[PDB]
UniProtKB/Swiss-Prot annotation, chain A:
Name of protein: DNA-directed RNA polymerase subunit beta'
Family membership noted in the UniProt record: Belongs to the RNA polymerase beta' chain family.
Included range, full protein: 1123 to 1171 of 1317
The protein's role, per its UniProt record: DNA-dependent RNA polymerase catalyzes the transcription of DNA into RNA using the four ribonucleoside triphosphates as substrates.
Subunit structure, as described in the record: The RNAP catalytic core consists of 2 alpha, 1 beta, 1 beta' and 1 omega subunit. When a sigma factor is associated with the core the holoenzyme is formed, which can initiate transcription.
Superkingdom of the organism of origin: Bacteria
UniProtKB/Swiss-Prot annotation, chain G:
Family: Belongs to the RNA polymerase beta chain family.
The protein, known as: DNA-directed RNA polymerase subunit beta
Extra information: Mutations in the RRDR sequence (residues 423-449) confer rifampicin (Rif) resistance. Rif blocks transcription initiation but not elongation.
Residues of the full protein shown: 22 to 74 of 1169
Organism in which the protein naturally occurs: Mycolicibacterium smegmatis (strain ATCC 700084 / mc(2)155)
Role, per record: DNA-dependent RNA polymerase catalyzes the transcription of DNA into RNA using the four ribonucleoside triphosphates as substrates. This subunit often mutates to generate rifampicin (Rif) resistance. Interaction with RbpA partially restores Rif-inhibited transcription; once the subunit is Rif-resistant however RbpA no longer stimulates transcription.
Subunit structure: The RNAP catalytic core consists of 2 alpha, 1 beta, 1 beta' and 1 omega subunit. When a sigma factor is associated with the core the holoenzyme is formed, which can initiate transcription. Interacts with RbpA, which partially restores Rif-inhibited transcription.
Curated annotation (Swiss-Prot), chain H:
Species name: Mycolicibacterium smegmatis (strain ATCC 700084 / mc(2)155) (Mycobacterium smegmatis)
GO biological process annotation, one example: DNA-templated transcription
Parent sequence residues shown: 1 to 226 of 350
Residue runs in coiled coils: none
Domain notes: The N-terminal domain is essential for RNAP assembly and basal transcription, whereas the C-terminal domain is involved in interaction with transcriptional regulators and with upstream promoter elements.
Gene behind the chain: rpoA
Designated name of the protein: DNA-directed RNA polymerase subunit alpha
From Swiss-Prot, chain I:
Species this protein is from: Mycolicibacterium smegmatis (strain ATCC 700084 / mc(2)155)
A biological process term (GO) from this entry: DNA-templated transcription
Any one annotated GO CC term: cytoplasm
Function recorded in the entry: DNA-dependent RNA polymerase catalyzes the transcription of DNA into RNA using the four ribonucleoside triphosphates as substrates.
Reactions listed under catalytic activity: RNA(n) + a ribonucleoside 5'-triphosphate = RNA(n+1) + diphosphate
Residues of the full protein shown: 1 to 236 of 350
The protein's name in its UniProt record: DNA-directed RNA polymerase subunit alpha
Any one Gene Ontology molecular-function term assigned to this protein's record: DNA-directed RNA polymerase activity
Length: 49, 691, 572, 52, 76, 61, 53, 226, 236
């Protein structure tokens, strides 16, 4: 997240969450993990005021 | 028997139940011959609790010993020595199944043994230092009673051992056709079989007691228990097996226990089974039964419940036990003694009166309508209640006994009680849909369907099959011991004989002589880890005897043709049939079905109460709420959370709307939210609702 | 449908029963009807039957994991004291009939009843919400029937014999009825190949072009080369579905049901699965699958394989006594040797067993089980794991048919007990995980139809090398299927293959692959811009309906439950 | 806390003897609609005495 | 299509009902309100189609909806 | 503050809400399933909850 | 061994050198030790123990 | 070819209670179906008579014991359920069994009235010691199939009567087989052999006649279409 | 002794050649007793006439196609199989069919001898092109059930003959379904639903009546043993 950006961190999260399930053949559509991830990036740490 | 020998790690002074470390539950190599690795509870207590071994004894210091045969320079000796784990660790111990000559010499140059790391290795003859006493040494009593255990995985063996302790005794017991050599001792040592204390002759025999005349001019009398209640509700019946003029010997069984026949454990019935799917009624491990098992009471059981009621004083007056009670018809008191208690042998239905007990009420100001009604008719007025003892809603049977304790004769009634009455209600239970049956190999299932005798598949001779088990469950659940059980059961049911013309058959080279020929309806023993190898059983299947018509129904492969009972056409392929020994488990449907419309609630929580009591409501947990939310069922969730649980003002209105057929009113504020608001207000927090 | 005990249904519907009884003059007042019902008077069942009917009841198992664990059914009275459950929904409930128990609830309010029969009705929830694929399909024996029914075997009676010098074609039947008559006569085997005239079944898609270019209609007879069993099977499917002519096993049936759901209404799929259940049970009853000692064959070459491997094992064991290898290195060498032995014995087993053996017939058809269990049962168990996880060097040379020794059985129990004792912890961990996911994502709700944003996300449809061919990617199902295109799909030419805002499905996936394009932009909830919750168009088509999500969907709970569904299946 | 666990309490299984039963609440109303409404309206002033 | 006649509460077919409203939820409230009105009339607009022997109000409401006989306003 | 109290630490959440005089708006269906009010999702949203149905004049006639 | 045992033919191939001991010795012997029954001292003395307690 | 031939039935008594009957020739495919119909009718639709209730002098209910009687009441009921009885009148009939002193009481010690018969006198009922005293009164009724015991209070009976399950069907075993004949066309016609075995209550011939009659009456409904 | 409840029969006229008969309420265990017996009797008791063998002048060996006609030999064989023939007498009669020139040869253009009737004069036999000449002969017999084509390796000396399977039974397709139904007090009675399909020659009701009569006659063979034995009579 800090190096590449916000667009890339979501891809990594989804890929790593999906691969563990996929190893055992459990088919889960990406959008569920997508919804779970969406709520993880609702806030930003403030620096200057 | 297996409760007295249980080992427990929980309780005070041991592993705290809160912690319950996962690491200690697994098998350690020192369990061999000391603690059974197969017998454990299947719940969260897995591993922590296990049964003692068959040959194990406790050293005075509290360390479990086990016997081993001393061995010497290539020769096995007759000195059996008990060893502890530590003292056994110093030596080399060989397996029991290894071969030896007549003198005791090891035939094979290299012998498979155990080693200090708790490991399995091979060593030469000179290295060996001890041997196991018998193959059964590592298994407990219950696990020892499973034939062909070595053909079953540990999981299914554990399940079968656990379930063998749930088998309810039946009206008439039948010993298994095929079983272990242990079934005998497990009964004699259980203490449930009357044994002779001295050699002599039986003098007189009666259903209530037996008498024996010793050989030294002594007379002994044994009383037999009849229809006694057990802690778990079953019937602890006993019955004799001897006849007048019979010369008994010391330690000889005279009477059978609940699950006993001829002094052998009989936990279930052996019946004809065919392995094949059948129209999906046995789908997903369900079971299908012939109506025969219901007609002739093959699996009927007796169950006795014990109801109580105590009459004790109050500050408005004493409580009395009497025949007469207010506000009931005289026909309701048909089988009630003058002293209130029901007659012995009377049949009691649901909600009937067992003991009439009026108690002071003293509430005189009745409503004017009740005043008018009681003035119209002869029931002028009464000042007492009708708090009689009544059969629970779901129980029925016949009264088999009554006991009464009274302070009038200074009985040790706990302080605050004047009288106490106990009534025993016994009932027979035939097998029915929803009952649970299982074999000895962890293949339990519910009864999906009971079918008429004419719908069952039948052998060419015309005998229908009693049970049919699904094929798909056998291989995946991975318990093939049941197939061997079925085949050897068929071999035992119909006698077997092997001809001897060109010597003994090669497959029967090691078969003892007494096994060459046996009559019909014989019984066979297959010791665990020393049972019949599949070659001998295949030969026995191939050398079966014919039926009354001089023919063989089951071929040499253990299969036979079957005729469809519905259509009549023969099945396209042969089906495997035999005799399997099945149990009846105490997890009956007759006492697990319950449901509630509207009735008693809980005081403090204002919620319907649950549990054993009648009208036990169901619990709508949190995951159920999550499922309803995922469905988007907003209205149904509100109905299940307010109207039907804790809306005191809403329950009555909904009930009266249903009775009148009117529209259901919208739910109100539940008691839970009101109580939470009052609590937060009590904490000096001004929780104010806004609109 | 679901079966309810008479006593339970009566006592549970008691209020409605009393209302109707008093309505029909059977009782003069409510209390009289109550007392009459208390003892179950015979003349109340005629009222209960008209009361029970058309009144849905919710059935639920514990523990509940996904929303399909609660489902509405139409009750019907049944003798006994046990609830009869439809065999298809078991997988949805994860219920098995080795003694599970189920709870039943009754909706009272009109709104609750409407919800039960519209939203929660069992026949309207075939598609699994986790992946949008069907969950109520034949399983276990149900497949073994349709398998046996549709299997084609040569060298049977009644085959199709071509014309010869002295005789004309033999196995030709004027209609399926004639084939059925021949089968009853015992002259034609169901699994034997035949040539038959079909007049009510639509021909295959390709065969149609050369026969009825104008268009096939009912009554237009054509000639089919197929077994009678396949003809019987294909009449279960809707008449508009073309002849398939394939040996049905689990994945083929899944393909057929998936295709049916996409192009047909929900009711048709329910009726088709019911017909398939009936046929599968009926034909599995007669498939002849059975277990016996001589039926579980043992590879003859095992005595050769293990004897050969004995030399290698002895070689390693003697090489360790000289201190030329570490203890762990020797253990690894022995483990590799015995792994090779196990693989060899397993492949020898699959070589030896005939095609129609009941064990291999069950395993290969996809009905249940797996080949490793067959290898363990027949060939040998092999290596096992101690409590610490190390591979015990000594293998289990015996098999559960041959008869294990005392010490092999003793050492086998470690891993079995460990795995048996791990399940409770797995369930607890999965429950905690599901609790947390539900907690975090509980305000993700479809609040507005469309947020009107162009910020999508890239996804890949096809895989290819520098030289080779384009093939649908290995994870199209979990990533690309059931999305909405954020931007038009244009190839190297410029023509728009798919316009923006179009739903993405298997027909569209194939069309895009036909266009030779590998990547496309699809809308996402990561980029969704609506202030409150999310919007339907970014979420994509609902997994539980195959259509666009409607406003108010509680997608957060669905996502949490779908992620937590495989709680006890993620074993290392 | 009773039950070998810190989940149940001594008090969960207290059955209320005062809790209103809906059926009776209905029944009385029916009586009020059967006694006062019908049977009273059969003797005019002669029934009027019963009212007081 | 060729689908057989629906049985029990599956009558009428659900897919045909989905054409009459926005989605499942609106259909739930629509049918529930119509059934409530039918109860109001029964216990004192009535059923606008011929009822069954003792057909429940909700079944009659759904049968009316099958023919798009009524109309509703999504009161946003 | 209802859900926060439910999750980890009730005393801290209640104290902070009291000193701040905060108010919980009943949006989000954890709070609604506590109060017992029908959840604001699916059938319970205002878009569908206020649906009014009136029979057509043709059918009435 | 057991006088009244019904004849049950067994497939046993090995011989038993040690009969199965009492199945409830663990409880009864421990209790006898607790109460110090002389019928337990008689057996304890046989183990070469002087003045058992 | 349309042969103008009809099936014929021939009997063969294998024992006093076991009989084999051959029906032939039939058109191909009828043997198994007819055998199934006959078996389904015989096994569960042959009317008979069996005990309905028993009363003993010194027991108020079945979960007790009789002084001086080795067998329990439940064992006595189990033994009685094996009784083979036949009644000539539909109405209930009463039978008595009295025994005093030591000995063995069997089914041959009963004293049935006119119109009632028992065909297994060697059935062992119980044994009595020196002070044994067994008195029993049994009720016999006609019926078919299986009917479970009816509780007293439903029947309005006073305490003491012990209802028992009734086994009315006299058929013990049934089977059938089919062969291919050669009378008209090679292997294209079926010969059906049905074997019946009954308890000594009735001979197989009467049971077969009853099954045929009930089946004929049932198919009369189909015939009635005209 | 009288039955508990008298069964009744109702009819759903599914189609002009199909019908569904519901018999209810049967007592437990009788639905499957009646269903299979009725099905087998219907399929193999009603006699009828059907084509059994044919001969074609245009083809003598090498049964692939007849020159000058569009249809294949097997197609013509199947079309002839799908024919309705009613013969008064049971003699094995011989029939002819000749046509010349382009057009369509249909069942209505065949000349049947005395005592033979064809109920489907609109059944398409084949289509002939220009300069066409189709000559065929066939044999008609009465029979019962479905019989596979009898091999003529002994009578094959008369080369050119084409034996075929015979569908004698007017009933084409029968299937039964035993549903559960409720008597006033009990939920275990049986409703037997039987669907029957018939050729154009007969009607479903007549076929069902004939099957019932055949079954009654067949079981009379056993009923006659002892008419005095008690039976479960439905009554009138
Ligand atoms: Mg289960
Ligand atoms: Zn959006």
């Amino acid at each position: 997240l800090r190096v590449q950006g916000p667009r890339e961190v979501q891809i990594h999260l989804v890929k790593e969450v999906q691969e563990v399930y996929r190893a055992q053949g459990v088919s889960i559509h990406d959008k569920h993990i997508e919804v779970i991830v969406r709520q993880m990036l609702r806030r930003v740490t403030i620096i200057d005021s | 028997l297996t409760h007295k020998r249980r080992l427990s790690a929980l309780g005070p002074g041991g592993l705290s139940r809160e912690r319950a470390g996962l690491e200690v539950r697994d098998v350690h190599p020192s369990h061999y011959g000391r603690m059974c690795p197969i017998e454990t509870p299947e719940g969260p207590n897995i591993g922590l609790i296990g049964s003692l071994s068959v040959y194990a004894r406790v050293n005075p210091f509290g360390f479990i010993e086990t016997p081993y045969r001393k061995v010497e320079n290539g020769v096995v000796t007759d000195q059996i020595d008990y060893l502890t784990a530590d003292e056994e660790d110093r030596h080399v111990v060989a397996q029991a199944n290894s071969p030896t000559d007549e003198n005791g010499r090891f035939t094979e140059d290299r012998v498979m043994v155990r080693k200090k790391g708790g490991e399995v290795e091979f060593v030469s003859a000179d290295q060996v230092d001890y041997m196991d006493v018998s193959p059964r040494q590592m298994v407990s009593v219950a696990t020892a009673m499973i034939p062909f255990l070595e053909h079953d995985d540990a999981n299914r063996a554990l399940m079968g051992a656990n379930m063998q302790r749930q088998a309810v005794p039946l009206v008439r017991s039948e010993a298994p056709l095929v079983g272990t050599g242990m079934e005998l001792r497990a009964a004699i040592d259980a203490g449930d079989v009357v044994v002779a204390d001295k050699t002599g002759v039986i003098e007189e025999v009666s259903a209530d007691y037996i008498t024996v005349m010793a050989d030294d001019g002594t007379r002994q009398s044994y009383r037999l228990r009849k229809f006694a209640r057990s802690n778990h509700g079953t019937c602890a019946n006993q019955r004799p097996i001897v006849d007048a003029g019979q010369r008994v010997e010391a330690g000889q069984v005279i009477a059978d226990g609940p699950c006993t026949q001829n002094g052998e454990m009989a936990l279930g019935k052996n019946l004809l089974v065919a392995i094949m799917p059948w129209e999906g009624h046995n789908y997903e491990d369900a079971i299908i039964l012939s109506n025969r098992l219901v007609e002739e009471d093959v699996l009927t059981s007796i169950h006795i419940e014990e109801h109580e009621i105590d009459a004790r004083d109050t500050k408005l007056g004493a409580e009395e036990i009497t025949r007469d009670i207010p506000n009931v018809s005289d026909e309701v008191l048909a089988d009630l003694d003058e002293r209130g208690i029901v007659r012995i042998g009377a049949e009691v239905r649901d909600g009937d009166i067992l003991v009439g007990k009026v108690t002071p009420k003293g509430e005189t100001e009745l409503t004017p309508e009740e005043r008018l009604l009681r003035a119209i008719f002869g029931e002028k007025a009464r000042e007492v209640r009708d708090t009689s003892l009544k059969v629970p809603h779901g129980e029925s049977g016949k009264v088999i006994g009554i006991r009464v304790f009274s302070r009038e004769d200074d009985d040790e009634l706990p302080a605050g009680v004047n009288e106490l009455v106990r009534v025993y209600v016994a009932q027979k239970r035939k097998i029915s849909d929803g009952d649970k049956l299982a074999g000895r190999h962890g293949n339990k299932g519910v009864i999906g369907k009971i079918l008429p005798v004419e719908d069952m598949p039948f052998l060419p001779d015309g005998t229908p099959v009693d049970i049919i088990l699904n094929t798909h469950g056998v291989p995946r659940r991975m318990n093939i011991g049941q197939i061997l059980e079925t085949h050897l059961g068929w071999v035992a049911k119909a006698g077997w004989n092997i001809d001897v013309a060109a010597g003994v058959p090669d497959w029967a080279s090691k078969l003892p002589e007494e096994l060459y020929s046996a009559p019909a309806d014989s019984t066979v023993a297959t010791p665990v880890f020393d049972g019949a190898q599949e070659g001998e059983l295949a030969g026995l299947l191939g050398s079966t005897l014919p039926n009354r018509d001089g023919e063989v129904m089951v071929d040499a492969d253990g299969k036979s043709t079957l005729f469809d009972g519905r259509s009549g056409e023969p099945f396209p392929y042969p089906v495997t049939v035999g005799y399997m020994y099945i149990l009846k488990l105490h997890h009956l449907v007759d006492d697990k079905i319950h449901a509630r419309s509207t009735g008693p609630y809980s005081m403090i929580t204002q919620q319907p109460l649950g549990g054993k009591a009648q009208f036990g409501g169901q619990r709508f947990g949190e995951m159920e709420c999550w499922a309803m939310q995922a469905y988007g069922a907003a209205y149904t969730l509100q109905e299940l959370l307010t109207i039907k649980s804790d809306d005191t003002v809403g329950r009555v209105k909904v009930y009266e709307a249903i009775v009148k057929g009117e529209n259901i009113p919208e739910p109100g504020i539940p008691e839970s939210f009101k109580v939470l608001l009052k609590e937060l207000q009590s904490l000096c927090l001004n929780v104010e609702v806004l609109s | 449908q679901c079966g309810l005990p008479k006593l339970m249904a009566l006592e549970l519907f008691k209020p409605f029963v009393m209302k109707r009884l008093v309505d029909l003059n059977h009782a003069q007042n409510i209390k009289s009807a109550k007392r009459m019902v208390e003892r179950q008077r015979p003349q109340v069942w005629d009222v209960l039957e008209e009361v029970i009917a058309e009144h849905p009841v919710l059935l639920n198992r514990a523990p509940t994991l996904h929303r399909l664990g609660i489902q509405a059914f139409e009750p019907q009275l049944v003798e006994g004291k046990a609830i009869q459950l439809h065999p298809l929904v078991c997988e949805a409930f994860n219920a098995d009939f080795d003694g599970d128990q189920m709870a039943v609830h009754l909706p009272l309010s009109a709104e609750a009843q409407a919800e039960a029969r519209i939203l929660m009705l069992s026949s309207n929830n075939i598609l699994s919400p986790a992946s949008g694929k069907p969950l109520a399909m034949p399983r276990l024996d149900m497949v073994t029937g349709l398998y046996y029914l549709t299997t084609l075997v040569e060298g049977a009676t009644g085959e199709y014999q071509a014309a010869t010098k002295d005789a004309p074609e033999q196995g030709v039947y004027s209609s399926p009825a004639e084939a059925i008559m021949a089968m009853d006569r015992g002259a034609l085997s169901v699994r034997a190949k035949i040539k038959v005239r079909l007049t009510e079944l639509r021909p295959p898609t390709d065969l149609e072009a050369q026969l009825f270019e104008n268009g096939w209609k009912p009554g237009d007879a054509w000639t089919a080369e197929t077994t009678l069993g396949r003809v019987m099977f294909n009449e279960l499917l809707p008449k508009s579905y073309p002849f398939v002519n394939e040996q049905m096993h689990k994945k083929v049936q899944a393909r057929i049901i998936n295709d049916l759901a996409e192009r047909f209404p929900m009711i048709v799929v329910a009726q088709t699965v019911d017909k398939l259940k009936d046929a599968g049970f009926y034909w599995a009853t007669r498939s002849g699958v059975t277990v016996s000692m001589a039926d579980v064959l043992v590879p003859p070459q095992k005595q050769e394989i293990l004897e050969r491997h004995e030399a290698e094992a002895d070689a390693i064991e003697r090489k360790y006594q000289r201190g030329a290898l570490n203890h762990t290195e020797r253990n690894e060498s022995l483990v590799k040797i015995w792994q090779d032995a196990t693989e060899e014995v397993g492949k020898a087993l699959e070589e030896f067993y005939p095609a129609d053996n009941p064990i291999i017939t069950i395993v290969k058809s996809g009905a249940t089980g797996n080949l490793t269990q067959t290898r363990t049962l027949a060939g040998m168990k092999g290596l096992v794991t101690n409590p610490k996880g190390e591979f015990i060097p000594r293998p289990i040379k015996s098999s559960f048919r041959e008869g294990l020794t005392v010490l092999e059985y003793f050492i086998n129990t470690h891993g079995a007990r460990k795995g048996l004792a791990d399940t409770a912890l797995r369930t607890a961990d999965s429950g905690y995980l599901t609790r947390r996911l539900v907690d975090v994502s509980q305000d993700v709700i479809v609040r507005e139809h469309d947020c009107e944003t162009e910020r999508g996300i890239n996804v890949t449809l096809a895989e290819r090398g520098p030289d080779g061919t384009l093939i649908r990617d290995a994870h199209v199902e979990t990533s690309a299927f059931a999305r909405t295109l954020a931007t038009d799909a244009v190839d190297a030419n410029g023509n728009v293959i798919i316009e923006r805002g179009h739903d993405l499905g298997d027909p569209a996936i194939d069309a895009l692959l036909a266009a030779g394009i590998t990547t496309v932009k699809v809308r996402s909830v990561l980029t969704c811009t609506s202030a409150t919750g999310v919007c339907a168009m970014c979420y994509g088509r609902s997994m539980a309906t195959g259509k666009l999500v409607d406003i108010g969907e509680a997608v957060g709970i669905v996502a949490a439950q779908s992620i937590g569904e495989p709680g006890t299946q993620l074993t290392m | 806390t009773i039950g070998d666990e810190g989940d149940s309490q001594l008090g969960d299984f207290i059955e209320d003897s005062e809790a209103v039963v809906a059926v009776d609440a209905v029944s009385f109303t029916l009586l009020q609609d059967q006694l006062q409404s019908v049977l009273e309206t059969l003797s005019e002033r002669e029934a009027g005495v019963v009212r007081l | 299509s060729a689908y057989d006649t629906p049985l029990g509460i599956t009558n009428p077919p659900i897919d045909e009902l989905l054409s009459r409203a926005s989605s499942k939820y609106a259909l739930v409230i629509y049918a529930a309100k119509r059934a409530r009105q039918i109860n109001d009339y029964y216990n004192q607009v009535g059923p606008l189609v011929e009822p069954g022997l003792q057909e429940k109000p909700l079944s009659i409401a759904l049968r009316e909806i099958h023919g798009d006989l009524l109309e509703h306003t999504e009161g946003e | 503050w209802l859900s926060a109290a439910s999750f980890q630490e009730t005393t801290r959440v209640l104290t902070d809400a009291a000193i701040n005089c905060r108010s919980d708006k009943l949006n989000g269906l954890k709070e609604n399933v506590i109060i017992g009010k029908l959840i604001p999702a699916g059938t319970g949203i205002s878009r569908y909850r206020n649906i009014q149905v009136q029979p057509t004049e043709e059918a009435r006639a | 061994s057991v006088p009244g045992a019904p004849n049950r033919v067994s497939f046993a191939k090995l011989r038993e050198p040690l009969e199965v001991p009492g199945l409830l010795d663990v409880q009864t012997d421990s209790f006898e030790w607790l109460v110090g029954s002389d019928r337990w001292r008689q057996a304890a003395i046989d183990r070469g123990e002087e003045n058992p307690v | 070819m349309l042969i103008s031939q009809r099936p014929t039935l021939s009997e063969e008594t294998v024992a006093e209670n076991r009989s084999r009957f051959v029906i032939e020739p039939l058109e191909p495919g009828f043997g198994y179906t007819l055998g199934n119909s006959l078996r389904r009718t015989l096994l569960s639709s042959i009317p008979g008579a069996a005990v309905t209730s028993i009363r003993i002098d010194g027991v108020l209910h079945e979960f007790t014991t009789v002084p001086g009687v080795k067998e329990d009441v439940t064992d006595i009921i189990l033994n009685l359920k094996g009784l083979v009885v036949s009644s000539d009148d539909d109405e209930p009939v009463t039978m008595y069994l009295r025994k005093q002193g030591p000995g063995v009481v069997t089914a041959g010690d009963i004293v049935p009235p006119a119109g009632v018969t028992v065909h297994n006198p060697d059935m062992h009922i119980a044994t009595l010691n020196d002070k044994g005293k067994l008195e029993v009164e049994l009720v016999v009724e006609r019926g078919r199939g299986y009917v479970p015991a009816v509780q007293n209070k439903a029947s309005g009976a006073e305490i003491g009567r012990i209802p028992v399950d009734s086994i009315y069907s006299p058929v013990l075993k049934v089977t059938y087989k089919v062969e291919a004949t050669r009378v008209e066309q090679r292997t294209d016609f079926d010969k059906l052999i049905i074997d019946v075995e009954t308890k000594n209550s009735i001979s197989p011939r009467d049971a077969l006649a009853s099954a045929g009659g009930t089946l004929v009456e049932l198919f009369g409904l189909a015939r009635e279409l005209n």
